Design a protein around this ligand. Structure first.
Ligand SMILES: Nc1nc2c(ncn2[C@@H]2O[C@H](COP(=O)(O)OP(=O)(O)OP(O)(O)=S)[C@@H](O)[C@H]2O)c(=O)[nH]1
Ligand SMILES: Nc1nc2c(ncn2[C@@H]2O[C@H](COP(=O)(O)OP(=O)(O)OP(O)(O)=S)[C@@H](O)[C@H]2O)c(=O)[nH]1
Ligand SMILES: Nc1nc2c(ncn2[C@@H]2O[C@H](COP(=O)(O)OP(=O)(O)O)[C@@H](O)[C@H]2O)c(=O)[nH]1
Ligand SMILES: [Mg+2]
Ligand SMILES: [Mg+2]
Ligand SMILES: [Mg+2]
Lengths: 414, 392, 392, 391, 72, 42, 71, 71, 71
């Protein structure tokens, strides 16, 4: 069964496909698996409460008696033929669930640091496939591999001190001089032969073999079927985490960086990955600000310690003199005013940095939308200047029209 | 319609110089290449005018052109004389056999005929005549460089070389000196005559315009990720399609009677009439079965993974069709789809069927995470024919 | 011929010392390396003035400049001697031929002539004269140590080493010592005369300024491409783009009658007039056909996987264009886009077409999970030109 | 000028063996060849210094010692162990250092007999090779009975200037030398090591004369000296690609160093004609290499920078055109193979698509919305206007 | 010669039949020797062990197998 | 980590990459300014 | 088929080509099959000499090995 | 087993087949097994001679190596 | 321990077995160990003859290696 969630959204167990007992068995393994692998991913003002909440089967999904509720952890996971995918709530609409997939991967393209191509994703737009995050990241792995295997096969050179019936390469002399004449019929050479089954090819044969076994599309089954035939002579391996560390990216296999990072993102039971929606917006806004703020340079994660260090998500300073704090919040900001938890942190970030502070918030049809300019000016009775900026999201499309509107509102703010 | 396939090879082999009969296995690519050379140069065996040679994964350049090899010398201790491979024993042979018919006033025809004897010698070279072989080979490449390009295009004996399974070996490593030479222009006598200096023996070497290197590439193994520049431009690729037109009643009768004898063709007529009467009196059954199963292969997987037509070409009864479907089609079908079951039953259009007359029946015990494993099921008699009559 | 690709090789090889003609397959890279050296040295065969070798993955460092190679003597069969490769037999040949017209070798001009005989000797070196060869070699590097740099700047011959497919071998390993000699001011006579010490023989070695190295690498493959940044400085890369301008009506008559200067110029001209008259009297058809494929390959594939102008150069008739399409470049296009059918339909500009006069017909049978693949169609006649007029 | 010369001379007395590492295209082999020539007054290799260079087939058996068949009699091929390139230097640098000592090494007839059999270019006959192998056993019986004060100060400085030290498998080539390449583990040091060789079994120790100045490139990161125990031995001199030499005056000072005022007047008016076409600015090629090396530092790494061996041999604007389109733009395209919006940014033509751009945009597009550019060969003064926009 | 038949034997716990070399899945013809549990009955285990032993060993083999399956 | 200019071994290059990357360069110091860049480690 | 060393009456090592397993069973299947052929009776004495030599073990001297290579 | 040179005559260095450890221990187990067997009494006075040659803790002498070969 | 060819002045290549670094320390520690005590190590001149033939700087002659193998 395929189940899909948006951030802070619920599904009924009666309407859902499959079995009632089957889905709740899949989740308790996933929330437990998120507990052991929680510390690998960074957060930003998450209020995670690592001791109590995550180990109570509330790590990724809150499984309840009457419904199934998603926390603010975005991504996907495939467990026990119950494929779960959690999209952001910002891309929620009012092919009907194919626009938020390419919106989320493009927000996973710019924020998280991936180097995927837009024409890789635009190939899938309109082919009426079943929307699934695991079916597209296997495709993004398989297409970027088959576009990097079609040119060259990555045959890397190792040297072997082999006793050959012929003579290839440099003849070892200290091993041939001390050769008895009863065994003179084989040369003892040290040939730098190119092997096809290197460590990077043992991984990509194993990463395809664990992908074709767990794929469900009709496009990925054809593409991984051609990749497995190209890797036919390679002896297979069992994938571990030691194999993904033992290879290093030099200049002769640098073009295999794009399929390998996606092969490390999906393989290392469980499959997939999860990230916090607060930090992914904190990373995504950081791409927008430094591009859109020419007058003043901006650094993310600068920290100033009170008295326990409370650090802003981003601060922009021209040289050192202007202190314009920019704290990225994923909150909906209901009733056109910041909440108690938000404005209390905005007060501290301005005071310990005469410092204006701007809060960027999400804006679409689903999320709360303010007017086009800088919506809310606030003073906290200390000559402060709190500006509520809102970035519109044309990221569901491929054109960046809202970046010009975000620059025009920031130019009036700067 | 096989003389056009002996003309499709023949029109490309005088224009590009060498071909590759690429196609799915069980088609006749080895048989078309072998029965074209035997029909052209009337020599039923290898050796003199053509040499059959297959490739493998551990085949190296030193076995093909030349390499240092230990060789015994008159039942005594070994020496380390450099041995010419299987190509250089026929590339030099195609030169010195063509240089008989050339009437020039500089040919050492007594010396060239002595070199031709030492090249066709089936025994290995003894050191009393190996130095006579290397000295006469030195006279050959002093003579070839002195002949003009006008007298090195019309060499009469067409030498051949059936490279079987050319994609199985590493093609760019075997053809070391033969991905700069195997063009029609880079041969001897052409406009771009190149005599390439070899690394091991140190003597210059150039392919003559007689040698045509026919290749028979299986493409269900070590697929189309080829060299794509060197081993793809030189070879004029001929697709040998798996033709189900040879699987009718008359076409199976015509194939198995021409190679047959007097008493064999009457028994092959009685056997094939018994076979197709058990199938439903369908004279076009095995054609329609192979054509239907080939369309399902080219839709799901690649178009060059189709089941060929050399398998069903040697059937005479239902029991022989059973032993070619369960040992040369269904193990071959489970090889292409990498032990998949939900798409291997759509090829037989048995996607929504289980536990009946199906070639892959579901086991009635699912796994822990809801997975299911199918199992091959042997059939017999009219149950198997009813399992074949719903593939169409 | 002398306009661009000759006058920019000769200017750049005389300035840098080494030229690599990198470019996609089907372009005149081996040809412009062969034509430039033969038109310079006036020797249409290898040997004395120039040597044409080619690299591969079985090529050794020990067989290039210096290595231990076991020879076959008479009474001691296994005798391990150090044998100079092909580069040390062309670098020492370029040195002792250039040192015939010097004025500081006045004690051993007979010794330099005797050393030149031992290097031009194609017979294998007997061990009674190999020590005479080694005594003259260590006399040579004593003589260039006492030679001034003003007299080693101008050596009047011009020796060449056309290595072909340089990028195939392990170029960091084959050029062992040559990764620090191959520069214009690091040969003999340059501003930094470097005489390095070879490992095996223990004799010093330095590339003369007489020598030039014209590599022709291929850049369609990527796992063998030359990314050694310390080696790309030594060479001087010349991109030979595949020019479709050699496929016009006036250009095919000028390229094919320059080489074939026989009395068949009336035969080629009336055949090339008949070929373009069947193409709609379009004198720029094959120029437009190769241009509208190479641009459409550049945008989706890499820019170095383009179709060259050596496929469509040897066309004569529509029957010959049909043979070079369906058997050389259409299996090549199915190798670039291997079961990526929406791309290969678009490269031939048949994206919306799925029936009729088209190369790839759509199958009328879709798959289980919504996949769909196409099928070749062997066209002929004016319908084939109607499938080529849609590309341009 | 003499700063890189003196910096090599300081570290070759402190650590013992210097390594000039840097991006390819700078003066690494040149400042290593000019150092050894100006310090030993010997322009060709020989006794006082020997140039070698490493590769993957430069194994241990031919560098220090290994078995080598050698008979010099055309009969009775004697399978004897012969010393490599290094041990023929370190034994030569020792027995040349045992001349100037007064009375510590009492071998004044037996050391000079060993030196004349070590510098002998003709290969050793077996009637004198038994003398060479017997005197070498006397040498390591002599060394060991000398005080460290009469062994630390050996006068004549020997140099084994090697090249591409990273290119060979350096932990395999350096065998017994992996523990002897410190300044205090040599002969005469505080902790001398008479280490034993495997094959011949005769002991061995490096003299304090022999300095190993070894140049390497660090753009190939596939083969860089990442062994952390062969970075303690060597002293790593940074040789960055310095664009200060590509001025008008600094290019006139370098290129007119050895011409004897014959072609120097031709070179002076040729550089006057080059910079008159670049815009009458003496500082063009300095900031051209600077704005490329900075823009290639922030993208690829610090180590893939364009050197100054490319642009140093330009004379006219035509020779700059033939070093741009044929040496560095094919180099810039193979850093970024089919990575087009990056290589457009190194030339900072990122908004420029058509016109005087090196990479014009193809008028076609893709089926999935992709695009790719095409290299545009520019000529004339339009090439300089396409080049001055980089600065 | 056409006499020489090549009867292979393949322990496929480590290497599957799809993981062979490509000139082994087409030149040869594969027979799956399935693990038959029907050789482990009470009467089938007696008949298999009756071929190797003698007559007096068979009554001891009969009594031991009767002692085995009574405990199970 | 916060020092990007002045007495520091690695100055920051003034422009960033096209997609948010930024590299440094090894600044050679001398004298007491080197010690002032060394005593801030401890 | 391969190379294998062999002593010649306590002398230096003499290399000789000794057939492996597959060639010793393929040649044995040939010379045993030619007994019951009516056309191969032109050399029935010499073929039978080969079959006795091909089933015995350790050919000790070259006088029967050169007989073996002649047959 | 493999080939080793021996201390034969001066100009007559010979390559014999000196047995290793596994052949020597399996022969020694076979010789000691047949030494106490009842039906192998045809040459039991020579099997004890072969046992002394196999427990000989030194390289075998060339004047009696053929006695080891014949036994 | 390994094999090593050794042609001295005019003899043939007699393939001697040369002890490596470790056995020339292990035998040298054992022989210098037994040289100081006297419980049952008879032949103190014989043990001293083995110690001289272990600290030889020159390679061993075949008239001296054979007595070194016996000791
Ligand atoms: N006359 C003439 N012929 C040309 C020209 N360019 C290519 N050709 C022809 O192309 C043919 C082969 O081109 P070639 O140079 O050999 O490709 P290549 O460099 O070897 O291709 P690769 O596989 O190594 S990558 C030759 O027959 C030659 O006649 C040209 O500019 N003029
Ligand atoms: N006068 C002068 N010439 C220089 C200087 N730097 C480089 N050159 C010149 O540039 C040329 C190339 O420099 P070179 O030393 O050979 O580069 P490299 O470091 O050795 O190149 P690599 O492949 O080993 S990494 C030399 O001929 C040298 O004359 C310099 O600072 N002063
Ligand atoms: N008579 C006849 N037999 C054919 C034809 N095509 C194939 N065969 C048969 O196919 C068999 C050879 O198959 P082969 O070429 O080895 O298949 P492949 O090499 O794996 O592609 C032979 O036994 C032929 O009898 C044909 O056109 N006519
Ligand atoms: Mg075949
Ligand atoms: Mg070529
Ligand atoms: Mg260098």
């Amino acid at each position: 069964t395929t189940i899909t969630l948006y951030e802070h959204d619920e599904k009924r167990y009666r309407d859902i496909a499959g079995d009632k007992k089957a889905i709740q068995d899949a989740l308790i393994k996933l929330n437990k698996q998120f507990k052991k692998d929680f510390k690998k991913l960074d957060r930003s003002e998450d209020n995670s409460d690592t001791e109590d909440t995550i180990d109570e089967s509330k790590g990724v999904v809150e499984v309840y008696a009457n419904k199934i509720k998603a926390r603010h952890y975005v991504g996907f996971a495939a467990v026990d033929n119950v494929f779960l995918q959690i999209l952001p709530k910002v891309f929620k609409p009012k092919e009907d669930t194919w626009e938020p997939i390419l919106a989320f991967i493009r927000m996973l393209d710019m924020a998280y640091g991936l180097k995927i191509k837009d024409h890789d994703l635009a190939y899938l737009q309109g082919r009426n496939l079943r929307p699934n995050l695991y079916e597209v990241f296997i495709y993004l792995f398989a297409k970027s591999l088959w576009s990097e295997v079609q040119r060259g096969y990555h045959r890397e050179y190792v040297e072997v001190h082999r006793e050959e019936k012929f003579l290839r390469g440099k003849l070892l002399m200290s091993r041939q001089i001390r050769k008895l004449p009863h065994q003179l019929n084989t040369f003892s050479v040290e040939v730098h032969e190119l092997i096809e089954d290197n460590l990077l090819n043992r991984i990509f044969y194993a990463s395809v073999r664990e992908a074709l076994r767990r794929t469900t599309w009709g496009l990925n089954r054809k593409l991984l079927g051609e990749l497995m035939l190209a890797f036919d002579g390679i002896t297979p391996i069992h994938l571990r985490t030691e194999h993904f560390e033992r290879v290093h990216f030099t200049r002769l296999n640098e073009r295999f960086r794009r399929p390998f990072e996606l092969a490390k993102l999906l393989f290392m039971e469980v499959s997939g990955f999860f990230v916090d929606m607060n930090k992914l917006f904190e990373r995504f806004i950081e791409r927008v600000l430094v591009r859109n703020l020419p007058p003043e340079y901006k650094l993310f994660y600068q920290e100033s310690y009170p008295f326990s260090s409370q650090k802003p998500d981003y601060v922009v300073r021209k040289g050192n003199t202007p202190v314009v704090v920019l704290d990225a919040k994923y909150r909906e900001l209901k009733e056109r005013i910041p909440s108690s938890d938000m404005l209390r942190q905005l007060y501290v970030y301005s005071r310990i940095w005469p410092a204006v502070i701007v809060i960027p918030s999400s804006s679409t049809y689903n999320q709360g939308l303010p007017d086009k300019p800088l919506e809310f000016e606030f003073f906290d009775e200390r000559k402060l200047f709190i500006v509520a900026y809102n970035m519109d999201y044309v990221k569901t499309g491929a054109i960046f029209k809202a970046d010009k509107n975000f620059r025009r509102s920031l130019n009036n703010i700067i | 319609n096989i003389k056009e396939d002996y003309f499709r090879v023949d029109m490309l082999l005088n224009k590009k110089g060498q071909v590759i009969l690429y196609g799915p296995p069980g088609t006749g690519k080895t048989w078309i290449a072998r029965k074209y050379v035997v029909e052209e140069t009337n020599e039923k065996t290898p050796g003199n005018k053509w040499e059959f040679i297959t490739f493998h994964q551990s085949y190296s350049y030193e076995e093909f052109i030349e390499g240092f090899r230990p060789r015994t010398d008159n039942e005594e201790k070994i020496r380390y004389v450099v041995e010419d491979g299987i190509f250089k024993k026929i590339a030099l042979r195609a030169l010195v056999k063509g240089l008989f018919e050339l009437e020039d006033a500089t040919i050492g025809k007594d010396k060239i005929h002595r070199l031709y004897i030492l090249l066709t010698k089936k025994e290995p070279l003894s050191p009393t005549e190996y130095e006579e072989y290397l000295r006469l080979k030195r006279y050959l490449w002093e003579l070839v460089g002195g002949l003009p390009k006008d007298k090195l295009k019309n060499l009469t004996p067409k030498f051949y070389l059936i490279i079987d399974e050319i994609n199985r070996g590493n093609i760019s490593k075997i053809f070391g000196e033969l991905i700069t030479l195997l063009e029609k222009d880079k041969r001897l006598g052409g406009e771009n005559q190149l005599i390439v200096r070899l690394p091991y023996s140190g003597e210059p070497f150039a392919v003559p315009p007689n040698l045509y290197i026919i290749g028979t590439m299986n493409t269900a193994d070590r697929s189309i990720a080829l060299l794509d520049v060197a081993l793809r431009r030189r070879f004029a690729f001929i697709e040998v399609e798996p033709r189900p037109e040879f699987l009718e009643k008359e076409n199976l009768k015509k194939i198995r009677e021409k190679k047959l004898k007097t008493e064999d063709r009457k028994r092959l007529n009685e056997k094939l009439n018994e076979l197709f009467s058990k199938l439903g009196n369908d004279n076009y059954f095995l054609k329609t079965l192979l054509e239907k199963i080939n369309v399902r292969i080219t839709v799901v997987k690649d178009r060059d993974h189709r089941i060929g037509h050399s398998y069903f070409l040697n059937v005479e009864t239902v029991e022989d069709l059973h032993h070619v479907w369960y040992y040369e089609v269904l193990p071959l079908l489970m090889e292409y789809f990498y032990n998949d079951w939900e798409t291997i039953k759509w090829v037989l259009n048995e996607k929504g069927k289980e536990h009946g007359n199906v070639f892959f029946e579901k086991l009635r015990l699912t796994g822990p995470n809801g997975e299911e494993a199918y199992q091959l099921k042997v059939l017999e008699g009219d149950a198997f024919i009813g399992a074949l009559k719903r593939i169409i």
